[PDB]
Ligand SMILES: OC[C@H]1O[C@@](CO)(O[C@H]2O[C@H](CO)[C@@H](O)[C@H](O)[C@H]2O)[C@@H](O)[C@@H]1O
Ligand SMILES: OC[C@H]1O[C@@](CO)(O[C@H]2O[C@H](CO)[C@@H](O)[C@H](O)[C@H]2O)[C@@H](O)[C@@H]1O
């Protein structure tokens with residue numbers, strides 16, 4: 001058995017246990033992935049590699065993560081591109097920006113990506129996003145085209161509480177987002 | 182607030198969350214620091230930097246570690262040099278071997294060492310160990326000459342369970358070693 | 363309080379390596395917004 | 410069951426940096442022994 005567990009309720013100006021990429025940085029007790037500026041990408045990874053499955057026993061880990069995040073857009077009509085919680089290879093670096101969310105480079109399935117991402121997508125990219133054109137939560141596997149999505153109404157500048165859980169017995173990943181109002 | 186917890190009840194051959202130095206390696210589910218061989222040093226560090234105190238608030242962390250170790254010597258008369266659990270700067274590399282235990286280089290207090298170590302010393306080094314010549318547990322701060330020691334009777338090849346705890350309200354570090362028999 | 367839930371079967375073992383790093387990503391493009399995280403906790407048990 | 414305990418006041422703040430790494434060390438010299446660790450658990454809480 002191996003268990004890993006951590007909790008951060010206030011970020012330090014020098015979070016040595018985090019790896020920052022692109023424009024990510026901590027300030028005022030928060031982790032800022034992007035400021036409201038054009039064409040930018042910010043990523044923050046926990047520094048320790050996590051043992052997710054074991055090739056010898058074939059066992060896969062059960063895990064649960066919870067975090068609070070906020071999207072603060074100029075108005076409800078100028079908002080992009082979104083945010084993701086992701087699981088990737090240890091050596092992961094930022095991928096394409098814009099609607100690719102800094103995690104994928106194409107809508108075609110790319111097995112060499114080896115990335116699973118839960119997206120909170122705020123902008124409709126006609127080439128792959130769901131046709132209703134609404135903002136949505138989606139589970140992405142090796143592609144920016146989600147395997148499953150759920151419309152979501154963004155509350156601009158409101159703190160969202162998210163819980164993501166993976167049950168190894170069942171192979172089901174579940175996501176839940178909650179606004180207090 | 183910030184908390185970190187982990188538990189490894191069996192080491193993997195590719196233990197990516199540990200940094201190995203000197204001769205340390207994982208084998209058959211365990212962590213081998215040294216084999217019964219002359220003049221060698223092995224160290225293993227958890228890879229994640231741990232936030233022990235905060236300069237902003239002056240808060241200091243409370244922590245507890247628990248481990249199981251085995252010393253297996255040729256006989257009860259040929260046994261050296263010892264084993265330690267230590268806390269040091271993130272960039273720590275192996276120091277002097279032999280009676281210095283791979284953590285210090287001197288018996289004179291050296292504040293630039295910034296290392297605290299709990300030693301399980303099995304060999305009497307006349308230059309600094311307690312004069313009773315017995316094997317001992319000791320608390321080391323920036324020097325191989327312990328600030329406090331307790332005689333301990335080594336049980337050759339037996340597993341010892343150790344619990345080390347630091348209480349930040351009191352600044353007291355407590356060590357307890359227990360043998361089944 | 364308003365909430366939204368989504369689930370999908372993801373065969374992690376066939377997708378990701380044995381060891382991984384977890385993290386957050388956010389981007390902007392011709393349009394934009396500030397993306398911030400205020401707290402984060404995690405847990406996993408293998409075996 | 411045989412046990413041994415030892416306590417000492419160590420003002421950590423004045424000795425170690427704010428960020429540290431924790432680990433194990435073992436050495437041999439003219440004399441020797443195999444030193445091995447079988448399991449390890451750790452819990453820390455700041456604030
Ligand atoms: O304003 C949206 C408009 O710009 C384009 C490129 O001309 O998309 C850019 O901006 C989008 C939102 O920020 C990003 O998703 C996209 O990746 C970026 O190229 C057009 O596609 C889009 O309609
Ligand atoms: O045999 C012990 C004897 O060897 C010396 C070296 O001449 O010490 C070496 O071995 C000791 C135990 O392994 C180490 O503590 C020591 O660091 C190493 O130099 C003599 O000091 C010692 O009496």
Ligand SMILES: [Ca+2]
Pocket residue numbers: 081082099121122123124125129
């Ligand atoms: Ca999109």
Ligand SMILES: [Ca+2]
Pocket residue numbers: 262263280302303304305306310
């Ligand atoms: Ca000694």
Ligand SMILES: [Mn+2]
Pocket residue numbers: 119121128129130136138144146
């Ligand atoms: Mn989408």
Ligand SMILES: [Mn+2]
Pocket residue numbers: 300302309310311317319325327
């Ligand atoms: Mn000693």
